[PDB]
């Protein structure tokens, strides 16, 4: 099999990883990296790494990406042990901050150099979070694009239609914790439990590609495979049409009622909606706790 590890860098990344653990995510190994020691105490993650004990004194990075970066460099040795043995690494974070913006490109570089498959699933701050935060976000993404094989970036501003009414500012990122889960889980489930899936294909589809898009669709009808896939390619999470992708990774997740016929019939929707020369690979994941629900996750990389 393959050894998959999910690393959360920063408070936001660590909070998303907490949600992943809480949601019942499995097949994967969680790691929590923060400069803030006291917030790292709140991590459900099995392995915890506090970085920049000297630089920060466990106080935090003060939303300074320069501090977060040196913190990771200072503890580069400790990061390497965590990543050791990993076939795939996920770097989960939120950009615009200090620990996430600065240190996550370091963890991503350390992982990719060690021969792991590095995908980073990160977010972009809300428009209201600041002007500095958006500024350090963009620079953080660019430092992430270079450091990783494939990068999925989800602007929080697109999650603004699905945010729960009367929610406070402190709970504003609950949907970010979900969408970060959907991206990490959509891939993790497909490798570890997927049916038509072999790792070298993922490696090919996702290595040194750069930017990617994520679409999730859910349906429970007679033609749920078609419906969920059509929802997936028409998802509000993709910035643009999937047609520009020269690779597509598709996860069809369903219960025991999910057939070979259903899987391909769903995959036909995703392949018309993309260029005719795409390398598309899909697989089936079985969660027996699903009776009539089916979830389709597509990752469109290549542009
Ligand atoms: N997914 C998620 N993102 C968050 C959360 N809190 C903050 N963020 C995002 O992460 C950025 C702040 O980074 P944060 O982890 O809080 O501080 P850092 O340690 O300096 O990286 C903000 O721009 C937010 O958009 C959270 O609970 N979950």
Q: Which residues contact 160 (CB under 8 A, 6 or more apart)?
A: 126
Euclidean distance between CA atoms 206 and 204, whole angstroms: 6
Given 177, 208, 239, which residue is the final one in a domain? Answer: 208
Known binding-site residues equal 11-15, 19, 61-63, 98-100, 129, 133, 156, 177
Same domain, 197 and 285: no
Given 159, 182, 208, which residue is the final one in a domain? Answer: 208
Same domain, 68 and 173: yes
Method: X-ray
CATH number, domain with residue 216: 3.30.1330.20
Per-residue 3-state assignment (H helix, E strand, C coil) for 69-93: HHHHHHCHHHHHHHHCCCCEEEEEE
Vertex 278 angle, CA 277 and 284, to 5°: 140
How far apart are the CA of 65 and the centre of ligand 1, in A? 13
Domain count, the chain: 2
How far apart are the CA of 20 and the centre of ligand 1, in A? 15
Which of 7, 11, 167 has most ligand 1 atoms within 8 Å of its beta carbon, as the pocket-test mutant?
11
DSSP of the chain, one letter per residue?
---EEEEEESHHHHHHHHHHHHHT--SSEEEEEESBHHHHTT---SEEEE--HHHHTTB--TT-HHHHHHHHHHTHHHHHHHHTT-SEEEEEEESSSSHHHHHHHHHHHHHHHTT-EEEEEEEE--GGG-SHHHHHHHHHHHHHHHHSSEEEEEEGGGGSSSSPTT--GGGTTHHHHHHHHHHHHHHHHHHHT-SS--HHHHHHHHSS-EEEEEEEEEE-STTHHHHHHHHHHT-TT-SS-GGG-SEEEEEEEE-TT--HHHHHHHHHHHHHTS-TT-EEEEEEEE-TT-SS-EEEEEEEE--
How far apart are the CA of 266 and the centre of ligand 1, in A? 35
Q: To what resolution in angstroms was this structure determined? A: 3.1
Residue appearing with tokens 């996550």? 104
Euclidean distance between CA atoms 7 and 201, whole angstroms: 23
Euclidean distance between CA atoms 294 and 96, whole angstroms: 35
Whether residue 223 contacts residue 240, with contact meaning beta carbons closer than 8 Å, is answered with no
Which domain covers residue 123, as residue numbers? 1-208
Same domain, 222 and 248: yes
Residue nearest to atom 24 of ligand 1 (CA): 125
Same domain, 219 and 96: no
Ligand 1 within 6 A of 125 CB? yes
Euclidean distance between CA atoms 199 and 192, whole angstroms: 9
Shortest-distance atom of ligand 1 to CA 101: 21
Shortest-distance atom of ligand 1 to CA 125: 25
Shortest-distance atom of ligand 1 to CA 36: 19
Euclidean distance between CA atoms 168 and 72, whole angstroms: 32
Same domain, 56 and 153: yes
Ligand 1 within 6 A of 97 CB? yes
How far apart are the CA of 176 and the centre of ligand 1, in A? 9
Breaks in the chain (C–N beyond 2.5 Å) sit after none
Q: Which residues contact 69 (CB under 8 A, 6 or more apart)?
A: 102, 103, 105, 106
Same domain, 74 and 64: yes
Same domain, 165 and 119: yes
Residue nearest to atom 28 of ligand 1 (CA): 12
Same domain, 88 and 147: yes
Q: Which residues contact 32 (CB under 8 A, 6 or more apart)?
A: 7, 8, 14, 17, 40, 43, 45, 47, 48, 49
CATH number, domain with residue 203: 3.40.50.1440
Shortest-distance atom of ligand 1 to CA 126: 25
Whether residue 216 contacts residue 232, with contact meaning beta carbons closer than 8 Å, is answered with yes
Given 162, 184, 208, which residue is the final one in a domain? Answer: 208
């Amino acid at each position: 099999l393959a050894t998959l590890k999910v690393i959360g860098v920063g408070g936001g990344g660590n909070n998303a990883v907490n949600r992943m653990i809480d949601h019942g995510m499995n097949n994967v190994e969680f790691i929590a990296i923060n400069t803030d020691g006291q917030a790292l105490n709140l991590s459900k993650a099995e392995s915890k790494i506090q970085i920049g004990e000297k630089l920060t004194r466990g106080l935090g990075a003060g939303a300074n990406p320069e501090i977060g970066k040196k913190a990771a460099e200072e503890s580069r040795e400790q990061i390497e042990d965590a990543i050791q043995g990993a076939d795939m690494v996920f770097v989960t974070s939120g950009m615009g901050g200090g620990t996430g913006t600065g240190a996550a490109p370091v963890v991503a570089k350390i992982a990719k150099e060690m021969g792991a498959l590095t995908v980073g699933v990160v977010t972009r701050p809300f428009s209201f979070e600041g002007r500095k935060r958006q500024t350090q976000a963009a620079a953080g993404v660019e430092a992430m694009k270079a450091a990783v094989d494939t990068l999925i970036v989800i602007p929080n501003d697109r999650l603004l239609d699905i945010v729960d009414k009367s929610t406070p500012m402190m709970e504003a990122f609950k949907e970010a914790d979900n969408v970060l889960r959907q991206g990490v889980q959509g891939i993790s489930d497909l490798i570890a439990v997927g049916a038509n899936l072999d790792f070298a294909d993922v490696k090919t589809i996702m290595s040194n590609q750069g930017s990617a898009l994520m679409g999730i669709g859910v349906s429970s009808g007679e033609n749920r495979a078609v419906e969920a896939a059509k929802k997936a390619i028409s998802s509000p999470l993709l910035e643009t049409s999937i047609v520009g992708a020269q690779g597509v990774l598709m996860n069809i997740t369903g219960g025991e009622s999910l057939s070979l016929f259903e899987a391909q019939e769903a995959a036909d929707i995703v392949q018309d909606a993309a260029d005719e020369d795409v390398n598309m690979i899909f697989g089936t994941v079985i969660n027996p706790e699903l009776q009539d629900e089916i979830v389709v996750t597509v990752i469109a990389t290549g542009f």
